[PDB]
Design an enzyme around this catalytic site. Structure first.
Site, mmCIF file in Angstrom:
data_model
loop_
_atom_site.group_PDB
_atom_site.id
_atom_site.type_symbol
_atom_site.label_atom_id
_atom_site.label_comp_id
_atom_site.label_asym_id
_atom_site.label_seq_id
_atom_site.Cartn_x
_atom_site.Cartn_y
_atom_site.Cartn_z
ATOM 1 N N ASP A 19 0.886 -1.229 -0.262
ATOM 2 C CA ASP A 19 -0.087 0.159 0.024
ATOM 3 C C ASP A 19 0.739 1.159 -0.020
ATOM 4 O OD1 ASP A 19 0.604 -0.754 2.758
ATOM 5 O OD2 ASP A 19 -0.382 1.042 3.258
ATOM 6 N N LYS A 72 -2.048 15.219 12.529
ATOM 7 C CA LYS A 72 -2.391 13.885 11.528
ATOM 8 C C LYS A 72 -3.732 13.799 10.952
ATOM 9 C CE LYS A 72 -1.744 8.829 11.367
ATOM 10 N NZ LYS A 72 -3.121 8.704 10.672
ATOM 11 N N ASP A 114 -6.829 1.246 -2.740
ATOM 12 C CA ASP A 114 -5.522 1.796 -2.240
ATOM 13 C C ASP A 114 -4.443 0.659 -1.766
ATOM 14 O OD1 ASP A 114 -3.697 3.916 -2.412
ATOM 15 O OD2 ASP A 114 -4.439 4.825 -0.666
HETATM 16 N N1 LIG Z 1 -7.518 6.951 3.340
HETATM 17 C C1 LIG Z 1 -7.958 7.184 4.515
HETATM 18 N N2 LIG Z 1 -8.784 8.368 4.578
HETATM 19 C C2 LIG Z 1 -9.494 8.681 5.880
HETATM 20 N N3 LIG Z 1 -9.104 7.946 6.907
HETATM 21 C C3 LIG Z 1 -8.230 6.849 6.661
HETATM 22 C C4 LIG Z 1 -7.558 6.802 5.486
HETATM 23 N N4 LIG Z 1 -6.839 5.664 5.938
HETATM 24 C C5 LIG Z 1 -6.935 5.224 7.017
HETATM 25 N N5 LIG Z 1 -7.918 5.951 7.843
HETATM 26 C C6 LIG Z 1 -8.094 5.806 8.831
HETATM 27 O O1 LIG Z 1 -7.016 5.950 9.870
HETATM 28 C C7 LIG Z 1 -6.827 5.258 10.862
HETATM 29 C C8 LIG Z 1 -5.746 4.226 10.936
HETATM 30 O O2 LIG Z 1 -4.627 4.712 11.646
HETATM 31 P P1 LIG Z 1 -3.467 4.691 10.823
HETATM 32 O O3 LIG Z 1 -3.065 3.088 10.781
HETATM 33 O O4 LIG Z 1 -2.397 5.276 11.457
HETATM 34 C C9 LIG Z 1 -3.404 5.299 9.201
HETATM 35 P P2 LIG Z 1 -2.214 5.572 8.271
HETATM 36 O O5 LIG Z 1 -2.274 6.642 6.953
HETATM 37 O O6 LIG Z 1 -1.733 4.157 7.760
HETATM 38 O O7 LIG Z 1 -1.007 6.244 9.080
HETATM 39 P P3 LIG Z 1 0.353 5.191 9.336
HETATM 40 O O8 LIG Z 1 0.935 4.943 8.053
HETATM 41 O O9 LIG Z 1 1.301 5.889 10.335
HETATM 42 O O10 LIG Z 1 0.019 3.814 9.807
HETATM 43 C C10 LIG Z 1 -8.377 4.384 11.031
HETATM 44 O O11 LIG Z 1 -9.018 5.288 11.841
HETATM 45 C C11 LIG Z 1 -8.746 4.716 9.498
HETATM 46 O O12 LIG Z 1 -10.105 4.479 9.350
#
Ligand SMILES: Nc1ncnc2c1ncn2[C@@H]1O[C@H](COP(=O)(O)CP(=O)(O)OP(=O)(O)O)[C@@H](O)[C@H]1O
Lengths: 212, 985, 201
Positions: free
Chosen positions: B698, B767, B906
């Site tokens: 991803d 964030k 995605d």
């Molecule tokens: N494209 C997107 N748009 C909106 N919310 C999203 C999203 N992708 C993930 N989320 C939300 O973000 C949360 C996930 O936490 P994370 O896993 O930290 C997202 P991340 O973009 O992968 O950050 P990371 O790479 O540091 O983990 C969940 O509440 C999920 O629903």
DNA sequence: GGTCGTCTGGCGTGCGCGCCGTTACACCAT
RNA sequence: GCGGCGCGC
DNA sequence: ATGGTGTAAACGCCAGACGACC
């Protein structure tokens, strides 16, 4: 315990000797979209039954200038009677979501009390009173749990069928029965629950209080 | 001049055509004729329908009578009447002279012989009979020959349909004879709509009282079945009396299904009724929908389509079977259309008035039919109760409390599911049109519409058929993936579920484990504070219990299907929304779900690991733990080997011993990966081991990755990893550092707000704000989000949260503009264009690069558009159409090389061996997609669709000035994306 | 005049008014004031506490109380009732809103005696914010007590106290200053605002 | 009727899935 | 579709 | 236990609205 039963049944306190000599009553049941009434006499006969369906009320605004001009038109057709009986509901201020309905009910009841109680300034004696719903339901055995069920089967027994049983409970005029049957047939498709309750409440008032 | 009664009678006649009682409809027709006022409501369509119905069984005289009636009327005989006449003339094998005279009369009106075959739709037997009749008249008449199927010639989709290239398509593992019986099993499951699944609750010991209750239930249900059958017979006997005398009745509709499936459906509806009641209109609508669906499914057995589907599916399975071979390999849709395909006929639903009466007739029959002993005289079960619902007065059907007590006493261990909500047991049908899709005997919609949306399908049906082939092939490819259920994880989950469940791992807890407030003998009313707190504690406990019950209600339904589908192979079809993203059809058990649902699923077909599979498995495990996200792949691999002893300890003994997997962000998937790694290491030859688990790839911040590509920003692309780099770049840290340096420089000169905020700026605060920019985030929502995180923080003084929150929102919005400028320019341009085209009175419409037309549904309450929602929704809906297209291009190019590709939008999933090929294909298709001009073609389509009229040129001039002001791009080069390492890594 | 008066009244009959009575009520008492065309007061009285607003809501008690209060009030051509500001979305202000609507319905029904015959409105609703902006006691939704303005007018004044009645208003004014009464001031302020805005342009 | 500037009140991140519930509560008699 | 919750991107 | 009883008054902005003029 009959006096306590009448205090629980009827919120306004009226002397018994005046209730014994009553000659006619009118029962009024209203809802968010409709209002209906009926007429009765000591030898129970039913001269009038009617409903007023379309109005521009509720929606989103509450304005007294519209309530007054609509209620003053509705009361115009009501004939004279010795007492007017209003239905009281178990709804209260605790139901936060159902509060607009409580507003509508309280405003309409207040305006009915103010208009229909003529000669109050001169005499000071009441002519409009409230009767409880669940107490009426318990007298016809329509109560499963704390909830009251429909009474359309009972009016289907009263009208469209003639079983005297040596003591019929209600009388109808000979000439006006066809219109009553046609109206009841028209209202079967969409069930309006106030037209039956008005007549049932009138019969309950005549049985529990006047003839006791 | 639409009228209700005309539509009612047209539906009546069509239903009589579907059923066998034609003479009843003939009676109502003759009786409606003969009334001066009842004649005017008659229509030519009714006469043609009755004529076709009489013609299909070869009744010559009745067609003559109907033609005489139409001649007596003023209606002009359409060509469908001529086709129905020729059908009867053919089947009856009449003399050539009469049919020749009929064709001469048709030629007198100017109708064409080809027109009756082409303009009006007819059944295959009807067209065959008409062709036989005209061949008897004129033997030289031949139908025009067919043509070879067209192929897409678009620039982006040219290489897929090229014949010269080398291809290696995948094949399944199951043999052909194994695959043939699963079709029969799925046909059996589809024919009977309901499916019974044993519940996973702990079995209770049966006492004498529960057996007595169950015996009473059995006797009562038998009596209810007899009563319902007799009541249905009496009801059908009188409604049919109404049809005589010319009244309309639902009698044609009530003889659609036999008595048995109506009684069983009514009994299931009575079983599904809650303790507290449900609205009457909802029951009416559900009953009408269910009976229409049952008719649609059950007509196909009588009509004979099931046998043809069986034969064509038996021939089609040779392409996907392991033992069988085909002469020339091709795509599944091309093979399905190369062989003779079953013709599919679309059906039209009944009008709302005909649907609403049927729910009442059968919802009011149930109350009268059913009676119950008092427990003497019989007392009814179902009652009418007038009550308040959703700030409105409605009518409600309510059951007897004795019924509720009897049903609560006996514990039924079974659950009920619909056939559409369970996975298929056979490979789905390929996608060939918007009308024909995955399910064998049920219709499915290509785009999910919430309610009353017909503009999507209208635009899907007026485009040329060649444009949608890429989307249809992608959906068919996603459909054919094979799944199976992992068992060890299921056993562990059930072991925790039956006892008190662990709630940190995602398993709900029983209602008996809810907290209980202390009980005091002292009355609360004595003290004000005591009665004040007691009510709050009681309300809080009731609220948390009500919240706790629903989670277990969800988990039971989720976990029943996993036990049901153990030791079985199943498939999951897909659909789309109006923007273009793809979702599976079964809601309860599929991917795109939670941790536990994803941990249970794995691939049915297996591939050998190869020389680089184990490294990718270890990298996937390290990604799932989540401890290292800011490091290159080499260091993740180095970390994986350092913790192998904990991996083996967790794999051998999960719930006894050291529990290392529970500390991860995704513990269940971590355990599922650790088991496979432990299996692979202990094997003699690791490169020969077979694998069944997907590996995930991803890319962070896809929307910014597309905005930077559109504007060719040099500084923007570096943050979103478009440029080559050795260490991945995080946008959140950059925003945090820019905010911190702004605060550092501002604090020295006349500030007090910045002085207390030192040390409290981090990734967590900004964030959510940075994540939500693609959707429009205003200043108000940003300040709310920052205030929530500030309140959760404890060291920060709570008095100064307001001015600090305003300062942070102002500085993050200032910091965003410096890095991203072209993004803001394009966003403002799209907002202005949407605002102006909404002011002119139109909705936003554009076309994707792959040819899918997209329309926006937002509209105020022949209705006026809503300007604000269109303007706010256009930019986030554009990028999602571009995200979907990279995915549907990547899937189609991965298919040609022989890969198994499944994707949650995605994110890309595949086997361990195919990661490098998938990455190269992804980057190549991204570069190919963004090399074409997108914004200029969008502007040209907008200038053509809107602002093309000779009227109101004054309002046209401003739109022409605005639409042609496309922003200029940057100096960044797009070819460098192919060498990027962390694009979607 | 949608912003000032909610019921639509024609301009011809609005200006030609001989006298007007302004009624302002609350949760403990009701007070009224009588002023004719020239800015001279004729009657200014306050009422004692009532049995209402304790526990249950009953219509007979409201009917008796209002029929007792209306009898003392003299006759005038127009009646003006305040339109306060409350929100149905607020949950903690429900009982006050209910009491205000019941009282408004009672007054509208009882005072329009001829409406059953002629069909004309003799009761009008005036918003508080218009008066607060015109007389500038407190700009916005806030409301100054207004005692200082009354001391400015009584004890070139805009409102004139007629002879042989000044002593009665002075005796009432010196009393009840420690008590928290606001209806007496607001009724007179609303009457002067009505005469300034609706009449004489 | 259309229009014509001009002051005011509502609103403030997209799409897609599940489950539950609709005067409540403490007491008292039998 | 009125309210209280949960999940995915 | 149930039945039955009693108790509960922190800011900005923009699509309309429209009175009047046309
Ligand atoms: N494209 C997107 N748009 C909106 N919310 C999203 C999203 N992708 C993930 N989320 C939300 O973000 C949360 C996930 O936490 P994370 O896993 O930290 C997202 P991340 O973009 O992968 O950050 P990371 O790479 O540091 O983990 C969940 O509440 C999920 O629903």
């Amino acid at each position: 315990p009959e006096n306590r039963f009448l205090r629980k049944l009827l919120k306004p306190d009226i002397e018994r000797e005046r209730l014994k000599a009553v000659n006619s009553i009118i029962s009024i049941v209203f809802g968010t979209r409709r209002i209906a009434w009926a007429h009765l006499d000591r030898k129970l006969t039913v001269l009038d039954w009617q409903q007023s369906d379309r109005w521009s009320l509720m929606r989103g605004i509450y304005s007294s200038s519209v309530y007054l001009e609509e209620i003053s038109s509705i009361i115009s057709k009501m004939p004279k009677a010795d007492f007017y009986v209003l239905e009281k509901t178990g709804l209260s201020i605790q139901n936060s979501s159902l509060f607009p309905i409580l507003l509508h009910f309280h405003i309409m009841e207040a305006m009915l009390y103010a208009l229909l109680n003529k000669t109050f300034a001169q005499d000071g004696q009441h002519q409009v009173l409230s009767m409880n719903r669940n107490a009426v339901g318990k007298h016809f055995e329509l109560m499963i749990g704390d909830s009251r069920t429909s009474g359309k089967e009972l009016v289907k027994q009263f009208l469209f069928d003639s079983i005297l049983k040596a003591d019929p409970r209600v009388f109808f005029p000979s000439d006006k029965i066809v219109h009553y049957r046609q109206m009841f047939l028209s209202t079967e498709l969409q069930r309006v629950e106030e037209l039956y309750d008005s007549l049932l409440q009138a019969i309950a008032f005549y049985e529990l209080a006047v003839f006791d | 001049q639409l009228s209700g009664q005309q539509q009612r009678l047209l539906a009546f006649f069509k239903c009589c055509l579907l059923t066998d009682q034609l003479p009843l409809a003939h009676h109502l027709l003759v009786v409606h004729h003969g009334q001066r006022q009842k004649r005017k409501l008659l229509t030519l369509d009714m006469y043609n329908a009755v004529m076709l119905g009489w013609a299909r069984q070869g009744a010559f005289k009745e067609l003559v009578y109907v033609l005489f009636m139409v001649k007596d009327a003023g209606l002009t005989p359409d060509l469908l009447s001529y086709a129905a006449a020729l059908q009867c003339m053919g089947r009856q094998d009449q003399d050539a002279g009469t049919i020749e005279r009929c064709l001469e009369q048709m030629s007198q009106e100017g109708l064409k012989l080809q027109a009756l075959f082409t303009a009006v739709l007819l059944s295959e037997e009807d067209r065959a009979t008409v062709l036989k009749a005209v061949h008897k008249v004129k033997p030289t008449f031949s139908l025009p020959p067919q043509l070879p199927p067209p192929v897409n010639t678009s620039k982006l989709l040219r290489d897929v349909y090229a014949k010269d290239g080398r291809v290696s398509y995948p094949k399944l593992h199951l043999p052909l004879k194994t695959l043939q019986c699963l079709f029969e099993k799925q046909l059996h499951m589809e024919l009977a709509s309901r499916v019974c699944v044993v519940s996973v609750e702990k079995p209770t010991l049966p006492s004498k009282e529960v057996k007595h209750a169950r015996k009473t239930l059995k006797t009562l249900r038998d009596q209810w079945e007899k009563a319902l059958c007799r009541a249905l017979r009496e009801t059908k006997n009188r409604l049919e009396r109404e049809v005589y005398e010319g009244r309309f009745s639902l009698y044609p509709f009530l003889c659609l299904l036999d008595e048995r499936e109506v009684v069983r459906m009514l009994l299931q509806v009575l079983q599904a009724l809650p303790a507290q009641g449900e609205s009457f209109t909802t029951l009416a609508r559900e009953l009408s929908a269910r009976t229409f669906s049952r008719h649609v499914v059950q007509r196909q057995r009588v009509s004979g389509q099931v046998q043809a589907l069986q034969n064509h599916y038996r021939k089609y399975l040779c392409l996907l079977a392991s033992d069988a071979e085909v002469p020339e390999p091709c795509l599944p849709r091309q093979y399905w259309e190369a062989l003779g395909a079953p013709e599919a006929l679309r059906e039209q639903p009944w009008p709302l008035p005909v649907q609403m009466e049927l729910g009442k007739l059968l919802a009011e029959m149930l109350v009268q039919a059913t009676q119950m002993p008092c427990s003497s005289r019989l007392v009814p079960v179902l009652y009418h109760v007038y009550s308040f619902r959703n700030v409105q007065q409605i009518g409600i059907l309510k059951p007897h409390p004795a019924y509720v007590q009897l049903l609560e006493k006996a514990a039924e261990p079974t659950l009920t599911f619909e056939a559409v909500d369970v996975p298929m047991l056979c490979p789905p049908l390929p996608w060939t049109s918007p009308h024909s899709g995955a399910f064998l005997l049920s219709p499915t919609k290509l785009m999910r519409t919430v309610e009353g949306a017909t503009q999507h399908q209208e635009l899907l049906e007026t485009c040329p058929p060649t444009a949608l082939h890429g989307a249809l092939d992608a959906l068919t490819q996603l459909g054919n993936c094979a799944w199976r259920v992992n068992g060890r994880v299921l056993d562990l989950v059930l072991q925790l579920f039956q006892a008190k469940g662990c709630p940190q791992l995602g398993v709900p807890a029983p209602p008996s484990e809810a907290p209980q407030p202390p009980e005091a003998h002292l009355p609360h009313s004595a003290a004000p504070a005591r009665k004040a707190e007691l009510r709050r504690e009681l309300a809080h406990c009731q609220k948390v219990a009500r919240e706790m019950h629903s989670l277990r209600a969800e988990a039971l339904y989720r976990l029943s299907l996993a036990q049901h589908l153990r030791d079985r192979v199943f498939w999951l079809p897909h659909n789309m929304d109006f923007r273009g993203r793809t979702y599976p059809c079964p809601p309860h058990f599929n991917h795109l779900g939670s941790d536990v649902a994803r941990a249970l699923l794995e691939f049915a077909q297996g591939r050998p690991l190869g020389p680089h599979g184990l490294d990718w498995l270890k990298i996937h495990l390290v990604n799932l733990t989540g401890l290292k996200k800011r490091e290159p792949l080499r260091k993740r691999l180095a970390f994986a080997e350092e913790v192998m002893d904990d991996i083996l300890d967790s794999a051998d003994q999960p719930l006894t011993g050291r529990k290392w997997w529970m500390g991860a962000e995704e513990p269940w998937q971590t355990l599922a990966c650790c088991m496979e790694v432990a299996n692979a290491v202990r094997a003699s030859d690791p490169a020969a081991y077979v694998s069944h688990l997907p590996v995930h790839q991803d890319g962070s911040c896809n929307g910014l990755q597309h905005y930077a590509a559109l504007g060719r920003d040099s500084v923007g692309a570096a943050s979103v990893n478009l440029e080559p780099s050795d260490v991945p770049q995080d946008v959140y840290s950059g925003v945090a550092a820019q905010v911190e340096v702004f605060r550092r420089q501002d604090a020295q000169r006349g500030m007090r707000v910045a002085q207390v905020l030192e040390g409290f700026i981090t990734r967590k605060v900004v964030k959510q704000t940075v994540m939500t920019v693609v959707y429009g985030v205003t200043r108000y929502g940003g300040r709310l989000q920052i205030e929530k995180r500030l309140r959760e923080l404890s060291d920060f003084p709570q008095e100064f949260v307001w001015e600090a929150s305003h300062y942070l929102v102002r500085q993050v919005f200032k910091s965003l503009q410096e890095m991203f400028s072209g993004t803001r320019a394009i966003q403002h341009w799209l907002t202005e264009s949407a605002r102006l085209i909404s002011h002119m009175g139109s909705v936003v419409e554009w076309v994707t690069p792959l040819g899918v037309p997209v329309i926006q549904p937002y509209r105020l309450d022949s209705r006026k558009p809503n300007t604000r929602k269109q303007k706010n929704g256009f930019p986030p809906n554009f990028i999602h159409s571009l995200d979907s297209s990279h995915m549907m291009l990547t899937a189609l190019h991965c298919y040609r090389k022989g890969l198994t590709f499944v994707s949650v939008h995605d994110c890309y999933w595949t086997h361990a061996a195919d990661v490098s090929v998938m990455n190269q294909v992804c980057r190549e298709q991204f570069v190919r997609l963004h090399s074409e001009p997108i914004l200029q073609d969008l502007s040209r389509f907008l200038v053509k669709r809107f602002c093309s009229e000779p009227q109101k040129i004054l309002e046209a001039s401003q739109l022409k000035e605005t639409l042609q002001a496309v922003p200029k791009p940057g100096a960044f080069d797009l070819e460098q994306v192919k060498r990027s390492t962390y694009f979607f890594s």
